[PDB]
Write a protein that binds this DNA or RNA. Structure first.
Lengths: 50, 75, 96, 64
RNA sequence: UUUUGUAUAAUGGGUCAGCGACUUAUAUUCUGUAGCAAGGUUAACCGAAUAGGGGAGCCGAAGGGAAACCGAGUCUUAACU
RNA sequence: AGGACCGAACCGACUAAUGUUGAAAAAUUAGCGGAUGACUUGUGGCUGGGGGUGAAAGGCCAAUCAAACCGGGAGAUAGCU
RNA sequence: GUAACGGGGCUAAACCAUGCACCGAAGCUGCGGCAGCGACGCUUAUGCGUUGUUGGGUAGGGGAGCGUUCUGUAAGCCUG
RNA sequence: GUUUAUUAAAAACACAGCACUGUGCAAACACGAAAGUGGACGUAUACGGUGUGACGCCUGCCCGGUGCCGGAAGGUUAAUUGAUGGGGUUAGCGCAAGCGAAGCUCUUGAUCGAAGCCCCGGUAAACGGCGGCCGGUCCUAAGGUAGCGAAAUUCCUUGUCGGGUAAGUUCCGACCUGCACGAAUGGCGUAAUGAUGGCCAGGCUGUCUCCACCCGAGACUCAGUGAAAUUGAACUCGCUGUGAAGAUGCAGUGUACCCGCGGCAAGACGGAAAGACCCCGUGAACCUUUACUAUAGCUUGACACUGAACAU
RNA sequence: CUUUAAUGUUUGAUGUUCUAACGUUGACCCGUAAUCCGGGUUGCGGACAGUGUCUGGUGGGUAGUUUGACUGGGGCGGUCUCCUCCUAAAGAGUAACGGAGGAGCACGAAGGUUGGCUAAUCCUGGUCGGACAUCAGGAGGUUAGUGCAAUGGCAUAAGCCAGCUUGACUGCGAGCGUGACGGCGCGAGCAGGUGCGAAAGCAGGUCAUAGUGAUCCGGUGGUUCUGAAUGGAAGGGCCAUC
C-alpha cells in the first residue's frame, strides 16, 4: 500500500542495483547498505535511488 | 456469510518409520515443530523435517517433556 | 491448442530469442564428406560443386564426424580441434 | 495444402535432440521486487515441456 | 431414439418398391508391407511418353546456445566437485 | 342553407346464429352505421423496401410485412435435435 | 370393487426350537461340439493323442471375413 | 368523420379553435453525391414544425437541473507553424579514453491559433418541478393556487352516511387520511351528437320456472357416384395392485357366445401445430438511451480557388 | 560588436475603398416562333459568399455491436482469488447458497549474530492510591507473549533486553514434496565475497501457514550478442527492473 518501491544502486559504477521497498512517511532518510556487487565481485556500498 | 475455505496444504508424515531415505527427502511436513529433529535430520524454515544423510527413518521419544524426535539411522 | 477457454500453453508461456540470418548461410561439414569432393582440395566452391552444401552457404566448418583416410587440403574453412587432429593424422593440411 | 504452423508456438518453443521441446518459464516478466532471488534464479533457465502438453505442442508445431 | 431409468400414457415410423449419410484433394504423424541403405528420393521439365534422362531440391547421418560461436560436446557461471 | 334528419341504390361492418376437411383461405341470414359529402366510383398515371404510403392500428405495399417478392453470396452459421 | 396373505382356503396350511428328506437357476458336475490365450513332447513353414484356462456386454479399441457394381486375368470358360 | 383488409370501431386518430416556435424569399423544411424539384407560379393576414383539441370560466407559482436563446473579462482547446534543447552520421584534431564544424537526419515541442466547454443573463402553452417544523423559524428554484376528488386515478376497500332493492362489492349523491388529482403531456363544467362504458324503470316477451306441440332442411333406409384427417402391429374388457410414479396389454382376480346398426362422448395422457408460457444457446431481429465504437448532417478554423489600393 | 531611429522592402493584423476572379433563382439582345442551357450587354453583390483537402465541437439522424457465471427453475439478494478451523469417517485428499473468522499488508528493524533474561493472576505491606499505576516479599508455573485471524508450535525458548552489524548476499544445487498443466514449495552441499562469535558455528529475511495477477504491448539501466552492400546507428535479443 503506502510502502513504495526503490532501488539501491551500487557505488562501484557497475550499474548493478538491488530493488526493495521503503516507507517514505516514517524514516525518510536515504537507505544505504553494504551489498554484494556481482559485476566487481566485492561487497560495496549501495545507495537509495529512483 | 460462510462460503470460504483454503486450499488444503497436504501436510503430514510423508515417510514412515523404518523406510529407506536418500539425503534431502522430506520426512514430515508440519505447522509448528510437532516432530523435532534428531540425528541426521534437519529442520527447515517452515519446520519441515528432511534427511541429511542416506539411511532409514526412526521415530523416538526423548527428553524430559517426552517430545517426539525423527532420526535417520545409517544403513 | 484450444483448451476450453483456459489460456493455452503457447499464449501462457513467454516469447524468447531471435532468428539469426548468419545461421542460414552457415553450414557443417562432416569428415566423411572430405573424400566426396573432387580434386583432393577442400573449399566452399568445390564443396558446392560436390553438392555437400547449398549454393547460398557462405560459411562452413568441418567437424569430427565419420573418418578421413586420405590426405586432404582444407582452405577458407573453420575446423574443430578434433577434426583438425583427424585431418592431420591422415597426412592432411589446414589453411586459413 | 501445407499445414500452417501456429506462429505463437513457433516463437515459444524449440525442438531438442531427442524430440522434446524447450521453453522459457512464466512469472519472470514484471512484478520482480516481491519475488525471492531463489525463485527467480530457478525460473531463469529453460525447461522441457511435460507429457500432458507434448501433444498440444506437437499439434501446433507440425514442421518443427 | 434418448435417458439414472421406457411395455411405457416420451420421440419416430400407414405399408411396399427405388434412392438416402464418414467422401476427395493436399500436407503431416504413427503402424504394416516392399526397395535401397549412411544413404534414400526426385519435382517441374525433356522424352516416339507408365521406359530413360532431370538430384533443382527435400529428409538423414550432430548437438548445444537467444545469439555470435563452439562442437561429441555445448550452455549456464569468474569457475563448477 | 346545412360535413342537417328518416330512408333505397351505393359505400361500410356494431350484435347474434350458422359455417370452421365451409357454398366461401373472412362468407350467409336477421338485425346495423353513412347515405350532397372530410362521400362514392370507373379509366389512366405517380410514390419501391431501411424505401413508399399512413385522419397513426406498426396499419397497408398482389391471400405474404417490427422491414415485400425473385435470384445470388450459399452447401452462411448451428458448442442443438 | 373384495382390494393391507397373489388367490383359493388354512386353527394350521400361523409363530418358536430342533431334525432329517425333497423341489428349486442359464450356478456346479455329466456327454457332444466351436473359438481364443498360454505351457508343453514329439516336432519344425506346424497341427495333435495332448493339458490348464478363458469365452455377458453399451460408448469405444483391436482382429478376421461375406456379399454388390466395375477393371485385368478373359478373343479364355459357361450359355438358346 | 378515420382506424388494426381477416378476433379490438373505441375513451384511440383526425378535427374547427388556441398557443409556442422557425422562416425576409435562392425562405425555413423536404426529396435528391448533383443538377434540379416541391414549399409556391405562394411572400409574415404566408409557409413549416410542435403541443393542446368546440364553446364557457380559466390557465396560479418556480429558470435551481436538462434544452434552446443572447452576451461576454477571462481559463482550457485542433489542424497549421516550428524557438530551444537532445541523439546518429563524418571533415578534422587526436602517440589516445575521447572530442567533434558543415550538410543530411531522428526526436522534443517555445509561439500563433476558432468554435466548443467553464462563466453571466433570459425563456416553462420548452423537457420539467411545486416542503417541513412549533402554537415565529430551517430548508428550497418554488413550495400545489383555482377547481375537482374512493375518480378510466383510492392499496387498506365491499371506506362512511344516505338514495334506490326484501336483500345493491355495481350505480347515484354527499364526505375528505388525494397510498399515488391539478391547471394547454391542459383543470373544471357544458346543450347537442354516439352501432361508446355503468345503473334504474315502463312495455315486451320461451331468456327462465319447465318445457309441449307443429311446419320445413339434415339425421335414418333404398338406388347412383364417392372424400378426409389418422394409422408400429393387434386375437383392442372391469377392478385392485405394480410399474418412467395415472395400464386393453404386467401380477392377481372378476366378467365375457361370434358380428353388425342407431346413438352419447368418460378413456384411448384421442387428432391438429418439433409449446407461444418457462428456461437455455457466449442464438436472431426490431426499438431506446447521458452503454461502446463509428458515421451522414450541422458547426469552427487553416490552406487552395483569391486580387489591387489606402490608413492605423 | 552592445543599442537604437526609417523606408523600397517580406510576410502578421484591424479598417475602409476598389474591380478584374467568383455569384446572381435582376433587366435587355442573340442561338430561337424555347420560363432549359449557353454566349453577350448592363446593373447589383464581391475577394465576401460558396466548393475541395485538413481540423476541433456536436451528432440514436443512421449503423455495428456488448450488456458474465454460479444458482434445489429464473429473477431480486449473495458469491467469484488467497489463508485458519470444523464437517473430513485417527496417512493424503474430499462437496453444498454447510458452520465460523481473516487477507490484498507490516518492518533496515520488527532481519543476522553474540551475550543475558523469564511471564499472567492473585495474596500480603507500603505517601497522595481508588477493585486495577510504581516498590518489597510470598504463593503460581505460562492460565503470559508472539506486528495483524485461526490452527499448530515455541523455555535450548520461536517470548524480552542490549552490543556489533547487512546473509533481506551473487552463481549453482544432490535429493525430495505438491500440482492435469502453467507452477508452487523445502533443501543439505559447492564457488565467491561478507557479518557476528575466542571457538565450535550461525546467517540465502522475519515462530509457520494469507499479503496476490500468466501472456502480449511498451518504458528505464547494463550488455559492441545481432546489426538486411560495407562502417556505424535504428531496431531486435540476453541480464536487472517498472
Amino acid at each position: 500500500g503506502i510502502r513504495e518501491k526503490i532501488k539501491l544502486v551500487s557505488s562501484a559504477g557497475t550499474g548493478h542495483f538491488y530493488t526493495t521497498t521503503k516507507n517514505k512517511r516514517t524514516k525518510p532518510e536515504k537507505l544505504e547498505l553494504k551489498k554484494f556487487d556481482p559485476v566487481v565481485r566485492q561487497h560495496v556500498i549501495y545507495k537509495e535511488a529512483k | 456469510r460462510n462460503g470460504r475455505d483454503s486450499e488444503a496444504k497436504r501436510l503430514g508424515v510423508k515417510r514412515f518409520g523404518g523406510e529407506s531415505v536418500l539425503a534431502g527427502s522430506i520426512i514430515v511436513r508440519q505447522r509448528g515443530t510437532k516432530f523435532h529433529a534428531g540425528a541426521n535430520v534437519g529442520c527447515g524454515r517452515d519446520h519441515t523435517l528432511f534427511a541429511k544423510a542416506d539411511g532409514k527413518v526412526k521415530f523416538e521419544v526423548k527428553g524430559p517433556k517426552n517430545r517426539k524426535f525423527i532420526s535417520i539411522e545409517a544403513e | 491448442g484450444f483448451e476450453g477457454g483456459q489460456m493455452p500453453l503457447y499464449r501462457r508461456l513467454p516469447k524468447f530469442g531471435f532468428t539469426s540470418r548468419k545461421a542460414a548461410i552457415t553450414a557443417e561439414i562432416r569428415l566423411s564428406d572430405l573424400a566426396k569432393v573432387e580434386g583432393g582440395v577442400v573449399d566452399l566452391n568445390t564443396l558446392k560443386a560436390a553438392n555437400i552444401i547449398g549454393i547460398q552457404i557462405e560459411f562452413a566448418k568441418v567437424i569430427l564426424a565419420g573418418e578421413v583416410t586420405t590426405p586432404v587440403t582444407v582452405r577458407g574453412l573453420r575446423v574443430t580441434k578434433g577434426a583438425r587432429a583427424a585431418i592431420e593424422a591422415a597426412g592432411g593440411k589446414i589453411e586459413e | 495444402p501445407k499445414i500452417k504452423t501456429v506462429r505463437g508456438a513457433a516463437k515459444r518453443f524449440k525442438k531438442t535432440g531427442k524430440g522434446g521441446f524447450k521453453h522459457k518459464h512464466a512469472n519472470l516478466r514484471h512484478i520482480l521486487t516481491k519475488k525471492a532471488t531463489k525463485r527467480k534464479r530457478h525460473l531463469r533457465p529453460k525447461a522441457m515441456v511435460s507429457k500432458g502438453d507434448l501433444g498440444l505442442v506437437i499439434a501446433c508445431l507440425p514442421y518443427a
